[PDB]
Structure formats: C-alpha cells, structure tokens
Design a protein around this nucleic acid. Structure first.
Length: 301
DNA sequence: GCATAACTTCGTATAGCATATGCGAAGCATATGCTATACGAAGTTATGC
C-alpha cells in the first residue's frame, strides 16, 4: 500500500480529477500487479512487455472472463500514459496474445449474462400480498418498487430525488423532474407515495430526501443531507424475492434473484409483449441505439 | 449489562456507454476509455429486557 499509494498520489497531484469509481479501480489493479511482481521477482513499476505477456497468461490460466483481462490491460496502459512512458499496448506481442486468448475463450462458449425480469405479474402479486400492510418499513418498500418499475429510472437516479423535486396536481397525476426533463406517474402508485409521505412526515422541508432510514421499532427518521445507500436498495429487491421464494441456490451463480436492472428489463420486455414500436421504447428509455435493447427483447415466452 | 435489527464502508469481479476509427469510399461494424452494478463480508449503534 504505502509505497504504491504514495506513487499513485503523484498521479493524484498530476491528474487530480476522476470519478470515485475510477481511482478506486486503478489502485486495486496495482495491488494485484505488485503482488505477482513480488512472488516472482521483477522490476515493479516500468513494465516489460514479456512480463505483461506472462501476467496475461497467468490470468488466462485462472480462466477469468475476457472482459476482466481487457480491463486489467487497460488500466496498466492508463497508468503508463498518465505517468509519461510508452504504452505497453504498443507491443505487437501483447496484442497478439490478447487476440489469441480472446478467440480461445470465445470459442470456449462463454455468454454474457442477463438479469431476471421483474415482469408486471410479479408486481401485481407482491402488491396483492402487501396491500394490507401497516408496518412502516413494508409501506416504504411497496412505494419504492411502485416507482422504480413504473418510472424506468436507474437505481442511483431514484435514490436522489428530493421532495423539492416532485410536482403534484390535485385529483390527477404526479410529475418528477431530473437533471430539464420531466416524467409522469400512473394514478395507482400516486396513492402509495401519498400514503408514505403522509404517514412518515418527511415533508417538513422539501430539501429532505424522500427515502430515508427506518429503525427497528418502526419510527422513521428525516434527513436533509444523508441519502440511503444503494447497497440497501438492492437489499429491498432481494428481500422481497426471498419472501416470495426460497433462499438462493448454493451454486454461486449470479442473477439468481432480482437486482436493480430487473425493473428496466421487466418494463422493456413487457412493453415488447404489448406490441409497442421499438423506437417508442428507445424514446422512453433515452437509450442510444445499440443492440442491448434487442438483446433485452431477445425472446418473448 | 448484553443481544439483536437494519444499515454503512471495502474489496475483487463484470456490464453499460460514448466515441472513435477503418474499410471504402456510404455507412456502419468492430474497437477503445471511462463509469457503474453485483455480491460477500466486516463493522456501527440504537432499542430492548
């Protein structure tokens, strides 16, 4: 850590701006490179392309998915670039091995994953079960899913919306605004969000976040400044799934239960089942055209 | 005086997206950098008997 961290902080001085997600990632690549570089002693910072070739073969023998290795190589090249040295990716051999292992592991039959779809009928079932609920933290989850499906928002978008961010019409719909665009909400879940607001009492300042922590004994808490962590919002979907079905299987496979994208895929696939014109889908999601939309539509029943 | 529920901070793995190049000479298929989940685990503190 210390030596590598102090080295990387030279780049922090030289290149101070990144997403919190990027500079998290580069450090965790460098940890693994340094560890390997110790366990077979070679010079640690200035890369030798033959050593990169050894490293890429060592990773390929652990059978990591090709999307991982291409990222490790990317981060190494970023580090050389912003430090001010020739890029290891300039090596012909490095390219040759990358192409070879890419073809090999593709021929080995890997597939990209796709999340389980939160189709409309599951929402209707869980609503039919929880509609009678009065325990506060049930109400919260029932409202949350009601928005997170209908409005097609990304999980880290909906986590942000302040009560200031919401507009209301008496006897009608409710409208939501997100960073110059406005999105509109069905006359059902309006009643759920109204119930949540009126029972929890978060409305004392529009600057409060609409979603907030709730404690063991059923009393809510306000906050103007502390948001609910997305790691708990995934803990909503996974909990309600574990309420409708038994526990996850021990095979360790991923996407065995709903996650943040299960709403988007559920909505898109249901709209395709409704026979919508696909450009209307692309307009609703705002998605720049790439075949991921087709892949979500890949099959119906 | 200790046990518990519901949540917050780290870490090592993959998917999304915006932009750019070829190849061929019009259009877009494939390639490249950067940003964001999914999951298991360790750690926090308020309420309770």
């Amino acid at each position: 850590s210390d030596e590598v961290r102090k080295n990387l902080m030279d780049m922090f001085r030289a290149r101070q701006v990144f997403s919190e997600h990027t500079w998290k990632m580069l450090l965790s690549v460098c940890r693994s490179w340094a560890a390997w570089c110790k366990l077979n002693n070679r010079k640690w910072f200035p890369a030798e392309p033959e050593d990169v070739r050894d490293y890429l073969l060592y990773l390929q023998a652990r059978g990591l998915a090709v999307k991982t290795i291409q990222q490790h190589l990317g981060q190494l090249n970023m580090l050389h670039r912003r430090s001010g040295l020739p890029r290891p990716s300039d090596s012909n051999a490095v390219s040759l091995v990358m192409r070879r292992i890419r073809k090999e592991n593709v021929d080995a039959g890997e597939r990209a994953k796709q999340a389980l779809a939160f189709e409309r009928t599951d929402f209707d079932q869980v609503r039919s079960l929880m509609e009678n609920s009065d325990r506060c933290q049930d109400i919260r989850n029932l409202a949350f899913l009601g928005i997170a499906y209908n409005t097609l928002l990304r999980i880290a978008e909906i986590a942000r919306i302040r009560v200031k961010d919401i507009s209301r019409t008496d006897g009608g719909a409710m409208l939501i605004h997100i960073g110059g665009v406005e999105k509109a909400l069905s006359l059902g879940v309006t009643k759920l969000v109204e119930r949540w607001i009126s029972v929890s009492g978060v409305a004392d300042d529009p600057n409060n976040y609409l979603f907030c922590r709730v404690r063991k004994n059923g009393v809510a808490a306000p906050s103007a400044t502390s948001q609910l962590s997305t790691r708990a919002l995934e803990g909503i979907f996974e909990a309600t799934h574990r309420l409708i079905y038994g526990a996850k299987d021990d095979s360790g496979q991923r996407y065995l239960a709903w996650s943040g994208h299960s709403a988007r895929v559920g909505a898109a696939r249901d709209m395709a089942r409704a026979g919508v014109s696909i450009p209307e889908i692309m307009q609703a999601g705002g998605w720049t055209n790439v075949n991921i939309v087709m892949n979500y539509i890949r099959n119906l029943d």
